[PDB]
Ligand binder design. Structure first.
Ligand SMILES: *Cc1cc2c(cc1C)nc1c(=O)[nH]c(=O)nc-1n2C[C@H](O)[C@H](O)[C@H](O)COP(=O)(O)OP(=O)(O)OC[C@H]1O[C@@H](n2cnc3c(N)ncnc32)[C@H](O)[C@@H]1O
Ligand code: HEM
Ligand SMILES: CC1=C(C(=O)Nc2ccccc2)SCCO1
Ligand SMILES: O=C([O-])[C@H](O)C=C([O-])O
Ligand code: SF4
Ligand code: F3S
Ligand code: FES
Ligand code: NA
Lengths: 238, 105, 588, 122
């Protein structure tokens, strides 16, 4: 079976602007490869094709792409989920970020927002434990749905609020992360964290568009975490 | 700050929801819309106050909402500030025109 | 100087668990430190680690670091260095508790303590009843660890050079390593990172095989860099094949599955580990379980299907709740890559190249070793190694599950703790000349100038195929000798290989060509080593020499790159806190 | 200076994103609409003649359409506003399914009010 692709190209030393290039791949009829498999095979035939990938199993977060309009990971999106008779499979970089080369975007702004929310345990050291901090299963369950983020940026690059203000709005991934520390029973700086999130932009740019939760390859829900931060902000400042 | 805006939008939305129910309620049960019954309805102190209250609530609610729109789509500072000026003036003019209109009934 | 020179006290090449732990320690100890990584740090292979960290916390039951030492020594089939293993098992608890205090989101027992599960090669009382000492965050422990260490590096404001590709070590006229050259992937700029301490933390090399659990980036860059600098590598024949990669995909499903009560079946529904390992059963050492699955297959009791030949890993009797709570990661991997729901159906699994026990020989301090003409150990000044790239050796001929994440942390931390002493002991290192630096670029220049040579894709396939066929779970002398001749030809083809993309902005082709040189050196050192060891020990199994030979081969194998010949190094048998565990027959 | 992929015609938007952009649009329209309604009110209340004059204005088909449009946008502001506040107050789940479902229902409720506005205006 012949597979047809339309893939975004851009090299600043060669291209005036980005363009779309047609590609073709012969595939095995009775076998369903992942998009990443196809990309790797395209690069065997066009070595100039640049994209990021590593784990190939949906864990590292390297190969976020816009595939037929929708964000996801190449390594766990089957060709069969993308392929339509008479249509090309359209592969483009995550939206809103600068394009370095071909399918490779500069994740700088995404990482900057993550750093803004101080994503590390802050514990004042008072009442230190004998060994590990004791965290009951009930307290530990609160981190579930939050710690699993793989920093793929599929969510944020699908968020319009993040498109218009990537430097001010923290964006879904970053807010999910802030929340992961906000409700960690071991983190003692909840109040001071919330006090850094009270401005008009950090959190409140989220208008429940819900693009974030439809694309997350890990099935996480930034909208819900954001909702929780907003409650905490009301509880503290209203 | 963000929490203040967030709360004000919702506080004024509740007030405006009640106003709409009041107004729709009038329109859906008034029957024959004569000048007499129309001026009767806006003569009422209840209608005058509620209407002006609504206009203040619009000023708050729409200002915060338009400010959010502008801070997404209008980056150049001078154009944004000028547009905010037009919008705030329009909202204030709304309230003021309202007073002039109800005072006159 | 042509090249820009960026100077630090320490340059850490690799931001997996080992390099991030080391960078953190080096920086806290007062020194400047550049942390390099060819991918964003949280995409390192550490993120994929599943089952957890083996450490005698004593949470699930009373434990003892000496029990863990025993399991490790025996698991290593007696070539693990005992002083080093002692250091690791004894230091482990403190090192792991400190990760918890960094915020690592470990799973929890009802009383609030870190959750520990059973795993392969874990016993109470020196070879007694099954233990549970693997500390876990569901089956995403590697993810949890790497993100936590990345977070701590942010907190510490570590200087990180993300997506920089280290090309080759730079040596001075005295033979000291004085930094490395590196290529900025985004811009194509090449720079000399000058350092008093160059710490290799580049990870493993599973991609020398046709089927591996390892990420695409696991290309043995540290092995190639070492070899090209004249630094030997040790025990390269010792490649762990994880018992349970998904058949047809190579993707790992954790030993955690068997730790939680799951087990292996053959086509007849026999739980055959009961026959092959009467005591430890499905939680026997990995070398044993892998061989057992293969024997079941060679003898025609393997199952078949679209996945190809395999054993069944039965989990459904654990129930939805336990699976979703303790093993959600493999549920996902199995549904995606096998089209099998483990809640209802067994996972089709096969032994799969997983982990490199070999590497650059080091001390506990992280200092890299070489040998002189007399066969005596000599520190390579300026060079250090931590993590999978190192051969301390704490894992000998067969690593225990969970002992790798422990090694990253303990030894990453140790290299950092001891860095000042190590730098003071080596003394002042003389500067690299302009030509020393240029020597580090020869390999890159060959690629940039070769336009009409061979396709590197064909070369990479031939290489992986050769390793799969000849250097897998079972080995034969004739086939290994022929494999080695095959690699020699392949390696010759690689010297005339073309680079088809000449661009400078985010050129991944150039990177992958550079990686290919390292796949070749790693495969080549593996093959020579494997032919050399004429016995079977741990993961190294040969039909022509089926027995373990403690008279002749109770030692490390050492590949010398200048002569491309082999020699031996002693196994340490002198722990300080308890007696050495003597070699004995090793059955599970 | 680097290109960016922000060609909105190449991105799939789910129904929740559609619901949302229409809410913003309804907001801008309603803001302008208040002035128009005030202008109309003022005239209708100034004299008996002003009332007849407002009645005649409302009599034009083109004006009916605009008025129906204004009431539809207003209806949309209200209904989807209420949906938003139901999430804010925890009466609606913030799963994706609940979001799609509640958006769909908002469209239906809006259309029903739109027809009712039509009947008021015709
Ligand atoms: C493959 C695997 C291994 C694994 C596991 C699951 C899988 C799928 N689960 C484990 C577990 O539950 N418990 C355990 O003890 N071990 C487990 N393992 C083995 C273990 O994960 C790995 O051995 C370990 O993660 C290796 O870590 P290390 O810090 O040594 O290396 P790394 O994570 O692979 O990172 C290497 C870094 O080096 C950089 N690099 C590589 N080459 C270059 C060049 N040339 N230039 C600059 N940087 C380079 C990489 O970018 C990476 O950051
Ligand atoms: C009366 C005239 C009104 C005007 C001119 C107006 C205008 C606006 C504007 C400009 C916004 C910005 C929304 C965006 O861009 O996403 C907004 C939002 C909003 N409106 Fe109104 N509105 C009015 C009435 C109402 C009423 C009666 C309700 C009650 C349901 C309401 C509920 C809301 C809510 C809850 C928001 C915020 C939603 C969010 O945070 O995304 N509005 N309005
Ligand atoms: C930023 C924002 C909106 C937005 O811009 N939505 C949007 C714009 C363009 C394309 C799709 C959605 S509508 C919800 C309120 O906030
Ligand atoms: O089985 C695993 O989870 C993983 O493979 C663990 C180690 O230690 O290697
Ligand atoms: S929340 Fe989901 S989509 Fe967003 S960065 Fe994390 S894993 Fe990726
Ligand atoms: S994050 Fe954006 S898409 Fe998400 S729900 Fe908030 S407006
Ligand atoms: S390659 Fe790691 S998530 Fe796709
Ligand atoms: Na090693």
């Amino acid at each position: 079976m012949r597979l047809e692709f339309s893939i975004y190209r851009y090299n600043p030393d060669v291209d005036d602007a980005p363009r779309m290039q047609d590609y073709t791949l012969e595939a095995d009829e009775g076998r369903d490869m992942m998009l990443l498999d196809a990309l790797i095979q395209l690069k065997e035939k066009d070595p100039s094709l640049s994209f990021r990938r590593s784990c190939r199993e949906g864990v590292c977060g390297s190969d976020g792409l816009n595939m037929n309009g929708k964000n996801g990971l190449a390594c766990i999106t089957p060709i069969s989920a993308l392929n339509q008779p008479g249509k090309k499979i359209v592969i483009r970089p995550l939206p809103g970020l600068p394009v370095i080369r071909d399918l490779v975007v500069d994740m700088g702004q995404f990482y900057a927002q993550y750093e803004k929310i101080k994503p590390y345990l802050l514990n004042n050291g008072q009442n230190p434990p004998a060994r590990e901090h004791l965290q009951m299963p009930e307290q530990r369950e609160k981190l579930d749905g939050l710690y699993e983020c793989i920093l793929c940026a599929c969510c944020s690059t699908s968020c319009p609020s993040f498109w218009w203000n990537p430097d001010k709005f923290i964006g879904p991934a970053g807010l999910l992360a802030a929340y992961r520390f906000l409700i960690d029973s071991r983190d003692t700086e909840t109040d001071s964290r919330l006090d850094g999130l009270s401005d008009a932009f950090s959190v409140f740019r989220c208008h429940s568009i819900m693009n974030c939760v439809s694309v997350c390859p890990k099935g996480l829900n930034p909208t819900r975490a954001i909702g929780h931060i907003k409650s905490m902000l009301l509880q503290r400042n209203a | 700050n963000g929490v203040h805006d967030f709360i004000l939008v919702r506080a004024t939305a509740i007030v405006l929801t009640l106003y709409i129910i009041y107004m729709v309620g009038f329109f859906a049960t008034s029957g024959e819309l004569t000048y007499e019954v129309w001026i009767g309805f806006f003569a009422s102190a209840f209608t005058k106050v509620f209407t002006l209250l609504a206009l203040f609530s619009i000023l708050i609610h729409a200002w915060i909402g338009m400010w959010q729109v502008l801070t997404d789509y209008v980056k150049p500072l001078a154009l944004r500030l000028m547009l905010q000026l037009v919008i705030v003036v329009a909202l204030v003019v709304y309230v003021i025109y309202g007073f002039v209109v109800v005072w006159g009934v | 100087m042509k090249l820009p020179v960026r100077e630090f006290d320490a340059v850490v090449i690799g931001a997996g668990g080992a390099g991030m732990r080391a960078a953190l320690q080096i920086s806290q100890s007062g020194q400047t430190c550049a942390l390099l990584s060819k991918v964003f740090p949280t995409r390192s292979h550490t993120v994929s680690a599943q089952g957890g960290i083996t450490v005698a916390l004593g949470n699930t039951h009373e434990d003892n670091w000496e029990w863990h030492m025993y399991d490790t020594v025996k698991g290593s089939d007696y070539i693990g260095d005992q002083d080093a293993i002692e250091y690791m098992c004894k230091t482990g608890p403190e090192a792991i508790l400190e990760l918890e205090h960094m915020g690592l989101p470990f799973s929890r027992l009802d009383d609030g303590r870190i959750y520990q599960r059973p795993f392969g090669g874990q016993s109470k009382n020196f070879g007694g009843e099954q233990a549970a000492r693997t500390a876990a965050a569901a089956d995403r422990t590697g993810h949890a660890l790497l993100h936590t260490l990345y977070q701590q590096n942010l907190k510490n404001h570590t200087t990180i050079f993300s997506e920089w590709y280290a090309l080759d070590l730079v040596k001075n006229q005295d033979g000291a390593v004085v930094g490395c050259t590196a290529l900025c992937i985004e811009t194509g700029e090449v720079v000399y990172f000058k350092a008093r301490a160059t710490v290799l933390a580049t990870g493993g090399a599973g991609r020398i095989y046709q089927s591996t659990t390892n990420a695409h980036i696991n290309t043995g860059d540290g092995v190639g860099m070492a070899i090209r600098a004249g630094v030997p590598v040790q025990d390269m024949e010792m490649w762990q094949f994880h018992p349970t990669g998904i058949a047809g995909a190579g993707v790992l499903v954790t030993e955690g599955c068997r730790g939680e009560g799951g087990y292996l079946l053959n086509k007849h529904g026999e739980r055959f580990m009961e026959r092959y390992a009467p005591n430890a059963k499905d939680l026997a050492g990995r070398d044993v379980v892998a061989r057992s699955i293969m024997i079941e297959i060679r003898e025609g009791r393997g199952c078949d299907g679209p996945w190809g030949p395999h054993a069944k890993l039965k989990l459904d009797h654990l129930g939805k709740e336990v699976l979703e709570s303790r093993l959600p990661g493999i549920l996902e991997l199995s549904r995606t890559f096998a089209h099998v729901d483990p809640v209802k159906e067994p996972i089709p699994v096969i032994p799969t190249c997983h982990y490199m026990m070999g590497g650059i020989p080091t001390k506990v301090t992280g200092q890299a070793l070489t040998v002189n003409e007399k066969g005596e150990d000599v520190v390579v000044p300026g060079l250090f190694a931590v993590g999978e790239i190192a051969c301390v050796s704490v894992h000998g001929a067969n690593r225990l599950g969970g002992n790798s994440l422990l090694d990253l942390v303990v030894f990453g931390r140790a290299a950092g703790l001891h860095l000042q002493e190590s730098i003071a002991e080596q003394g002042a290192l003389r500067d690299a000349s302009e030509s020393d630096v240029e020597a580090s670029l020869d390999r890159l220049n060959r690629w940039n100038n070769n336009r009409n040579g061979e396709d590197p894709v064909a070369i990479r396939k031939a290489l992986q195929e050769c390793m799969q066929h000849n250097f897998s779970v079972f080995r034969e002398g004739d086939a290994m000798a022929k494999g080695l001749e095959q690699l020699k030809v392949i390696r010759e083809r690689l010297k005339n290989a073309r680079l088809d993309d000449t661009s400078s902005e985010f050129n991944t082709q150039r990177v992958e060509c550079l990686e290919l040189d390292n796949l070749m050196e790693t495969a080549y050192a593996t093959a020579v080593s494997a032919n050399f060891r004429t016995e079977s020990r741990g993961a190294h199994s040969r039909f022509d020499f089926p027995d373990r030979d403690d008279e002749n081969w109770l030692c490390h194998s050492l590949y010398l790159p200048e002569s491309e010949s082999m020699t031996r190094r002693s196994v340490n048998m002198e722990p300080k806190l308890r007696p050495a565990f003597p070699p004995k027959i090793r059955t599970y | 200076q680097r290109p960016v992929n922000l060609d909105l015609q190449t991105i799939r938007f789910p129904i929740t994103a559609i619901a949302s952009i229409l809410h913003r649009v309804s907001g801008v329209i309603t803001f302008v609409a208040v002035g128009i309604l005030l202008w109309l009110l003022g005239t209708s209340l100034s004299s008996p003649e002003g009332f007849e004059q407002a009645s005649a204005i409302m009599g034009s088909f083109f004006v009916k359409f605009i008025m129906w449009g204004i009431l539809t946008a207003l209806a949309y502001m209200v209904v989807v506003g209420i949906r938003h506040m139901m999430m804010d107050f925890g009466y609606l789940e913030e799963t994706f399914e609940a979001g799609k479902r509640s958006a769909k229902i908002s469209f239906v409720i809006t259309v029903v009010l739109s027809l009712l506005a039509g009947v008021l205006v015709w």
